[PDB]
Structure formats: C-alpha cells, structure tokens
C-alpha cells in the first residue's frame, strides 16, 4: 500500500456538480459541458421529472457513445425539443423507462437509444425513484447535457473486465478515495497482475509508469488512467498504442450514485495496493445465494 | 396500485436482528436460528441454506468489523447445534482485495463431518462482493492477517419443489398488449428507516389477485429474502408453470444489494405490500443494464 503523489490527480480529478442554470430573466437555460480526460462522444442528459408543472425529482437519461461532427449546442437544442416520457416500473429490479422520441437529425448517431423505449436500473439514473408517480403521466424537461469525448483507448464495464485470478503473481490493486461536497467514499479495483519480483520492485515499476488519474462523466461518473511514463515489454505488446484505461464507475459500483447525486465529486487520494494474487482455484461467488446441490438453481 | 391487507404479512414478515449473545458470565455463546417460510414441512434430509456472521479481527488485537460468510444450500439431516459447533471449530481467514469490485475473500481450514454438504464453499477459497457480506469493508486491514470469530448461524429451510430466484434465473418481463403485475414492498428497519423496492411477478393476458390470497414473509437467504405463498386459487396455466406448487422466493441481497447497507446489524420487517398493475413494457423497448452504452460497437464488444 503506497500512495501516489497528489500531482497525479490535480489536473482532471474533479467532476462538477450537475445543476440547472438561469438566464438574465430567471428562466432555465439548458447547458452542456465537455470532459476530455474529438468525434466519438458519450452523451448523458439530466432533467426534471414532472407531471403532464409539479416537479417530482431529477433523472439521468444516458444516450451512449455516438460518432458525430455536430456542434454540442445543436445536439443540446435538438435534444431539448424532443418529447421524452418517464415511467417508474419493474423488471428484476425497479426501473425508469424513457419513451421513444423523434424525428432526429443531429442526434441520429444516438438513434438506437432515442428511437425506441429504454429500460434503465432506477438506482443508476435516479437517487429517489419513489418520488416518481405511478398514478400520473410523467415527462422529462432536460436542463443539462454532459458530454465525454472518447478515443477509439480501453473502456471497461463489468462484462468486459478480464480475469483477475492468477497463481504465482502480485496483484496491482488501486484504492481510490472520492471527496463529495464533506463525505468521503472509497473503492478498490484490480488493474492487473505482475506475473513471477518483490513488492518494492513492483513499486519502482509503477513509479516509472507516471500514472495520471482523472474523472469523466461516462455513465454519470468515470475514472480515467493515463500512462505518461514507461511500461514493460510484455504490457507494451499487450497494449501497443493504448496508454489510457477508463472504468464506468456507476456500472462497477452503482452504490456511488446515491452519494455523488446532485453533488460535486473529486479524487482526494489514490494508492497502489500490492497484494498476492487471488489463486485460480478460489471460487467466485457474485451471488450470495449459493446452491451446492443441483436442485434449487440451474447451472 | 392497490394495497394488500396487513394480515398478508403478519405471521412471517419479520427478520430478527443478527446479534451476538452472552452467557450468565458475559462470554459470547454462538447461536443459530431457523427460518422456514415456504418450507414448513418436517423431513429427515432437509435442504438448508446457511449464512454465518462473525467478528473480523486481527490475528498476531482489535475487532475491525462484522462480516457474513454465506455457505449456500446443502442437503443435511444433522442437528443445527452440530452444524454450529463444527463451524465454530474451523479456522476461517478473511482478506480484503479486489476483482472488478472490492472483495472479501474467506479461507476455511479444519476437516469437515456434519458440514460435508457445504464442502464446495468451505474446502476452497471463496470470493464475495464485499458490499453483499459487509457494510464497512474499509475497516478490514490490508497490512495485517484477519480472522473470522463466528457468533451466529442463520438457517433457512428450502423445499426443492419451490421456485427460488436470483437475477440470472429471473424470466423475461417484456410483453406487448398485457398488464404487468408488479409488487411494491416496504421494509421498516429499526435503524425507523423505511426502504422500498419493486419487482415484476408476471403479466396478465385485482379480483384475480384477491382470490390468490397471497402471503408474504421474510427469510435469511443471502441475509434477506422475500417469500410469497399462494393460499387461494390461480389459473390452470399458472399452476402448471409454477411446477404444480404455490411457493416463490427472491434473494433480495442479490437483486437489490443496496438493501444490505440499510438492514445491516438491524431488524427488518415488512410494513406495506401493494400490487402495482401497469401496462406491460413492450418487447421493442431495449434493456440497458449498464449506463455506459456504445451505439457504435467500436468502443465495447
Ligand atoms: C482490453 C483488455 C484489457 C487490456 C489490458 C489492460 C491492463 C491489464 O489488465 O493489464 C494486465 C497485466 C497482466 O496481468 P494479468 O495476470 O491480468 O494477465 C492478463 C489476464 O490474465 C487476462 O485475463 C488475459 O486475457 P484473456 O481473458 O485470456 O483473453 C491476458 O491475456 P491475453 O488476452 O493477452 O491472452 C493476460 O495477459 O497487468 C500487468 O502487467 C500489471 C501492471 C498493470 C499496470 C496498468 C497501469 C494502467
Ligand atoms: C420456474 C417457474 C418460474 C415461473 C413461474 C413464476 C411466476 C411467473 O413468472 O408467472 C408469469 C405469468 C405469466 O407471465 P408472461 O405472460 O409475462 O410470460 C409468458 C408465459 O410464461 C408463457 O407461458 C410463455 O410461453 P407461451 O406463451 O405459452 O409460449 C411465454 O413465453 P414466450 O412467448 O416469450 O416464448 C412468456 O412470455 O404471470 C402471470 O400469470 C401473472 C400473475 C402472477 C401471480 C403471482 C405469482 C406468484
């Protein structure tokens, strides 16, 4: 467990609070913000969920990655002219369903999401889903469009994560602390394994990497790592031109949304946690409801 | 949106607080508790779900936190006091590490006898999502060896004819031109703090739901489970589908892991249950379990 220097997160370690703005005459004026931690763009908008004037709550509507040359003000204005419905319902978990909208022009790169209904896990796109009505029609009045520019870099979600188990190796784990306007949350993630080399030797290799950490708004909150120094011949062959790693933090740690919602978020500490790797023989139990017989749960 | 009567959850709608007990001289005495919703019939070989709770403490000495160690379903005829005593004689190590998410890794040692039906979990290392088995994983040390000192064994009996659900076994909820039967459940937590969640039961092609005479109770599968029993009547097609039986169970910490942060170290109780009848979500709607969507297919495979 060795701490990185604060300079490694100073430049981009801050994510601004999502907030509506007013014009000179007090009317809400939609806005956008671009994070670049420029044609591939991730879009996520925020709006008021209202009756069809009464404001029930705020909700996020992720649109995903699209390739576009349109100016962000044209993406924003077209988005605010759409009629987006909001429903609170359930599948396995409680859901927020956004209705279909159209026609599109500047937003055609995000048509897969916008032109048909979209079902989201309510916990990832809203803190207080219980405020959305079940007996009244609801609609989204968008006030902010968050944009994060991507480089077609390594972008991770739980299903694309690689195997972390290894038998004779040192795991390079990363412990990150977030200060929320103060409340402090922390999480750990596995970066890789240094296959067998002492823990101190591994630390010197990590110092030479000159890692930089920053935050983005992919999924509402993402962690971006950039290698500004040097890496091994084996890791260099695996990665090639890739120097950037990005993690969708609301998909890995959905519990973060309840904490960062409607608040500013910033990296306050980052530490390398070098531990023996978890052996391949150990069993992964993602679900606590385990069935050792064959009779209660299939495969 | 119609509320069920409180009588529908009175009998089994309560889950006791997990807490250690002391003897007449102040020393901790491990205990067990059996929950039998949806499995009240007595049989020699019982299907039993086991989850224990212990103090995570230093080895070479402070109590750092409490953690749950799920053992899963095993078929056994042993008395619960023999399962408990053998479990407390094992030397279980605890490690805080990471995969995709932060993990708590257990390691058991000591041969098994009454615990042989749970050997798959106990005889090799077990990697759990820290959020589902511990509220404050950041209290577990990274620079010291840690051990589990078990104080409670929670047991929930199962009936192999019943339906037991986890996210990967739950069925398709989308349908065109149907009415969804959704269920809104409220839990009162002593903390009182009230949490609520909704789940999809099925789709119809209120009076039919009243005739079902549903009963709701809580169990300790995964630390907290919801059990529904049909005491009235249903259609011939729905009885054939449910496997010719009237029990349905949901592992609530696997569906709604956020509940653990709220119910941890507290008693939990059903305070309200309502049917929420809505138009079904059409099949044309897209499911986005991950908020990081890639419409280009060039960023994510
Ligand atoms: C796109 C996927 C991610 C790309 C790499 C993103 C970075 C990353 O994950 O590094 C892993 C690497 C090796 O560790 P590790 O034991 O995890 O080795 C890899 C791992 O086993 C994968 O699961 C394998 O893929 P697959 O499932 O069998 O296919 C992969 O092989 P292949 O696939 O080649 O056959 C293995 O190489 O870690 C270091 O060198 C430690 C320093 C890390 C410093 C990082 C600082 C930022
Ligand atoms: C292991 C068993 C698990 C399932 C049983 C556990 C309970 C459960 O899941 O019920 C679902 C049932 C109907 O569900 P729903 O109509 O959405 O689902 C369809 C139904 O299952 C048909 O039988 C399937 O085949 P088919 O059309 O014949 O070909 C059809 O498949 P396919 O057309 O897509 O291929 C399914 O889409 O719900 C009610 O009746 C509402 C009252 C619920 C009352 C409360 C119950 C406690």
**Ordered DSSP codes for chain A:** -EEPPTHHHHTT-EEPPP---B-TTS-B--EEEEE----EEEEEEEEEEEE---EEEEEEEEEEEEE--S-HHHHHHHHHHS-EEEEEEESSSEEEEEPP----STTGGGHHHHTS-EEEEHHHH-S-GGGS-SSS-EEEEEEEEEEEEE---EEE-GGGPPP---SSEEEEEEEEEEEE--EEEEEEEEEEEEE---HHHHHHHHHHHTEEEEEE-GGG-EEEEEE-S---HHHHHHHTT--EEEEEHHHH-TTHHHHHTTS-EEEEEEEEEEEEPPPTTSEEESSS--BSSSSSS--
Residues A198, A199, A201, A202, Cα dihedral to 10°: 120
Residue nearest atom 4 in ligand 2 by C-alpha distance: B242
Q: What are the backbone angles phi and psi of residue A277, rounded to the nearest 5°? A: -65, 150
- The answer to whether B180 and B281 have CB atoms below 8 angstroms apart is yes
The label of the residue with tokens 């106990």 reads B122
Q: Which candidate from A64, A91, A295 shows the least CB-CB separation from B295?
A: A64
Length of chain B: 301
Terminal C-alpha separation, chain B: 41
User: In 10 A of CB B21, how many CB atoms?
Assistant: 11
Query: What is the C-alpha to C-alpha distance for residues A1 and A3, in angstroms, rounded to an integer?
Result: 7
Question: What angle is formed at CA B172 by the lines to CA B171 and CA B176, rounded to 5 degrees?
Answer: 145
- Which residues have C-beta within 8 Å of that of residue B297, sequence separation ≥ 6? none
Nearest to residue A49, comparing CAs of A143, A121, A112, A147? Answer: A143
CA distances for B121 relative to A281, A290, B291, angstroms: 12, 9, 33
| Gapped junctions in chain B, after residues (C–N > 2.5 Å) | 60, 191, 205
Judged by CB atoms closer than 8 Å, whether chains meet at B290 and A157 is answered as yes
Residues in chain B within 8 Å Cβ distance of A113: 286, 288, 293, 295
**Resolution (Å units):** 2.1
Query: What is the C-alpha to C-alpha distance for residues B151 and A181, in angstroms, rounded to an integer?
Result: 38
**Does ligand 2 come within 6 angstroms of the Cβ of B199?**
no
* Most A-contacting residue of B275, B299, B301 (CB-CB within 10 A), to test interface: B299
Residues in chain B within 8 Å Cβ distance of A88: 198
- Ligand nearest to the CA of residue A232, numbered in listed order: 1
- On the 0-12 / 13-18 / 19+ scale of CB atoms within 10 A, B15 is buried
- On the 0-12 / 13-18 / 19+ scale of CB atoms within 10 A, B176 is exposed
Q: What are the backbone angles phi and psi of residue B271, rounded to the nearest 5°? A: -115, -20
CA distance A117 to chain B (A): 4
Show the tokens assigned to B31: 């205990």
Q: Which candidate from A97, A111, A275 shows the least CB-CB separation from B281?
A: A97
CA distances for B205 relative to A40, A228, B245, B280, angstroms: 43, 59, 21, 10
Q: Which candidate from A93, A125, A290 shows the least CB-CB separation from B121?
A: A290
- The answer to whether A53 and A164 have CB atoms below 8 angstroms apart is no
Query: What is the C-alpha to C-alpha distance for residues B204 and B180, in angstroms, rounded to an integer?
Result: 6
Longest CA pairwise span in chain B (Å) = 68
Q: Give the gyration radius of chain A's Cα atoms.
A: 21
Hey, CA dihedral for B97, B98, B101, B106, is it positive or negative?
Answer: negative
Nearest to residue A209, comparing CAs of A189, A248, A239, A188? Answer: A239
Nearest to residue A133, comparing CAs of A210, A54, A219? Answer: A54
Residues in chain A within 8 Å Cβ distance of B182: 89-90
- The answer to whether B133 and B92 have CB atoms below 8 angstroms apart is no
Could you tell me which CATH number the domain at B42-158 has? 2.70.20.50
The torsion region of residue A102 among left (phi > 0), alpha (psi -120 to 50) and beta comes to left
Query: What is the C-alpha to C-alpha distance for residues A108 and B288, in angstroms, rounded to an integer?
Result: 19
Query: What is the C-alpha to C-alpha distance for residues B202 and B210, in angstroms, rounded to an integer?
Result: 16
Query: What is the C-alpha to C-alpha distance for residues A8 and A210, in angstroms, rounded to an integer?
Result: 8
Could you tell me which CATH number the domain at A2-13+154-276 has? 2.70.20.60
Position in ligand 2 atom list of the atom nearest CA B163: 1
Show the tokens assigned to B173: 């909820």
* Most A-contacting residue of B76, B96, B100, B253 (CB-CB within 10 A), to test interface: B100
Looking at the DSSP bridge assignments, the partners of residue B68 are B53
Q: What topology does CATH give the domain A38-150?
A: Topoisomerase I; domain 3 (2.70.20)
| Gapped junctions in chain A, after residues (C–N > 2.5 Å) | 37, 52, 152, 181, 196
The label of the residue with tokens 């010291």 reads B144
Position in ligand 2 atom list of the atom nearest CA B237: 23
Q: Give how far the C-alpha of residue B262 lies from the chain's centroid of Cα atoms, to the nearest Å.
A: 14
Terminal C-alpha separation, chain A: 38
Looking at the DSSP bridge assignments, the partners of residue B53 are B68, B152
Intrachain domains A2-13+154-276 and A38-150 with the same fold? yes
Task: Give the CATH H-level superfamily of domain B2-12+162-279.
Answer: Viral matrix protein, C-terminal domain (2.70.20.60)
Query: What is the C-alpha to C-alpha distance for residues B40 and B159, in angstroms, rounded to an integer?
Result: 9
The label of the residue with tokens 């209705």 reads A99
- On the 0-12 / 13-18 / 19+ scale of CB atoms within 10 A, A286 is middle
Judged by CB atoms closer than 8 Å, whether chains meet at A282 and B127 is answered as yes
Query: What is the C-alpha to C-alpha distance for residues B49 and A297, in angstroms, rounded to an integer?
Result: 12
CA distances for B18 relative to B122, B154, B193, B224, B266, angstroms: 22, 9, 17, 11, 7
CA distances for B256 relative to A74, B15, B37, angstroms: 39, 17, 20
Show the tokens assigned to A22: 């007013």
Site to substitute for ligand 2 among B160, B203, B240, most atoms within 8 A of C-beta: B203
- Which residues have C-beta within 8 Å of that of residue A25, sequence separation ≥ 6? none
Q: What is the 3-state secondary structure (H, E, C) of B165-197?
A: ECHHHCCCCCCCCCEEEEEEEEEEECCCEEEEE
Show the tokens assigned to B277: 């009848």
Looking at the DSSP bridge assignments, the partners of residue B34 are B155
- The answer to whether A63 and A44 have CB atoms below 8 angstroms apart is yes
Residues in chain A within 8 Å Cβ distance of B102: 187-189
Query: What is the C-alpha to C-alpha distance for residues B165 and B151, in angstroms, rounded to an integer?
Result: 28
User: In 10 A of CB A33, how many CB atoms?
Assistant: 14
**Does ligand 2 come within 6 angstroms of the Cβ of B142?**
no
- The answer to whether A221 and A250 have CB atoms below 8 angstroms apart is yes
Q: Which candidate from A91, A116, A171 shows the least CB-CB separation from B173?
A: A91
Task: For residue A103, say if its preceding peptide bond is cis, omega within 30 degrees of 0.
Answer: yes
Q: What are the backbone angles phi and psi of residue A142, rounded to the nearest 5°? A: -70, 135
Query: What is the C-alpha to C-alpha distance for residues A39 and B243, in angstroms, rounded to an integer?
Result: 53
Query: What is the C-alpha to C-alpha distance for residues A284 and B2, in angstroms, rounded to an integer?
Result: 41
Q: Are strands B268-279 and B14-15 parallel, antiparallel or unpaired?
A: antiparallel
- List chain B domain ranges: 2-12+162-279, 42-158
- Which residues have C-beta within 8 Å of that of residue A70, sequence separation ≥ 6? A106
Query: What is the C-alpha to C-alpha distance for residues A94 and B126, in angstroms, rounded to an integer?
Result: 29
Nearest CA in chain B to A283: B126
Put the strands of the sheet holding A211-216 in their side by side order: A154-156, A244-248, A222-227, A211-216
- Which residues have C-beta within 8 Å of that of residue B22, sequence separation ≥ 6? B28, B29
* Pocket lining for ligand 1, CB < 6 angstroms: A 154, 162-163, 166, 169, 172, 191-195, 209, 225, 227, 235, 238-239, 245
- The answer to whether B163 and B242 have CB atoms below 8 angstroms apart is yes
Quickly list DSSP for chain B: -EEPPTHHHHTT-EEPPP--EE-TTS-EE-EEEEE-TT--S--SSEEEEEEEEEEEEE----EEEEEEEEEEEEEE-S-HHHHHHHHHHS-EEEEEEESSSEEEEEE--S--STTGGGHHHHTS-EEEEHHHH-S-GGGS-SSS-EEEEEEEEEEEEE-TTSEEE-GGGPPP---SS-EEEEEEEEEEE---EEEEEEEEEEEE--HHHHHHTEEEEEE-GGG-EEEEEE-S---HHHHHHTTSS-EEEEEHHHH-TTHHHHHTTS-EEEEEEEEEEEEPPPTTSEEESSS--BSSSSS--
Q: What are the backbone angles phi and psi of residue B211, rounded to the nearest 5°? A: -65, -25
The torsion region of residue A210 among left (phi > 0), alpha (psi -120 to 50) and beta comes to left
Query: What is the C-alpha to C-alpha distance for residues A251 and B101, in angstroms, rounded to an integer?
Result: 10
Query: What is the C-alpha to C-alpha distance for residues A184 and A180, in angstroms, rounded to an integer?
Result: 6
Show the tokens assigned to A128: 């207080």
Hey, CA dihedral for A104, A107, A110, A116, is it positive or negative?
Answer: negative
């Amino acid at each position: 467990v060795s701490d990185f220097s604060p300079s490694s997160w100073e430049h981009g370690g801050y994510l601004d609070k999502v907030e509506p703005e007013i014009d000179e005459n007090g009317s809400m004026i939609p806005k956008y913000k671009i994070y670049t931690p420029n044609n591939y763009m991730y879009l996520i908008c925020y709006g008021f969920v209202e009756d069809v004037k009464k404001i029930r709550t705020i909700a996020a509507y992720p649109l995903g990655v699209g390739k576009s040359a349109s100016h962000p003000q044209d993406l924003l204005e077209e988005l605010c002219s759409l009629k987006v419905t909001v429903r609170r319902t359930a599948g396995s978990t409680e859901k927020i369903v956004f209705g279909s909208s159209g026609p599109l022009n500047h937003l055609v790169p995000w048509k897969k999401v916008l032109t048909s209904g979209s079902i989201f896990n309510a916990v990832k796109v809203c803190r207080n889903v219980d405020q959305i009505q079940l007996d009244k029609h609801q609609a989204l009045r968008i006030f902010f469009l968050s944009i994060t520019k991507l480089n077609d870099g390594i972008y991770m979600i739980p299903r694309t994560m690689l195997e972390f188990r290894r038998n004779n190796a040192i795991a390079f784990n990363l412990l990150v602390y977030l200060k929320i306007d103060f409340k402090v949350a922390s999480f750990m993630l596995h970066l890789g394994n240094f296959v067998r080399y002492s823990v101190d030797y591994c630390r010197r290799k990590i110092d030479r990497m000159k890692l930089q950490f920053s935050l983005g708004s992919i999924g509402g909150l993402s962690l971006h790592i950039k290698i500004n120094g040097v890496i091994s011949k084996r890791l260099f062959a695996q990665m090639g031109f890739q120097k950037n790693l990005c993690f969708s933090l609301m998909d890995i740690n959905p519990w973060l949304n309840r904490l960062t919602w409607n608040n500013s978020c910033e990296i306050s500490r980052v530490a390398a946690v070098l531990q023996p790797s978890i052996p391949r023989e150990f069993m992964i139990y993602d679900d606590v409801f385990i069935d050792n017989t064959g009779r209660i749960l299939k495969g």
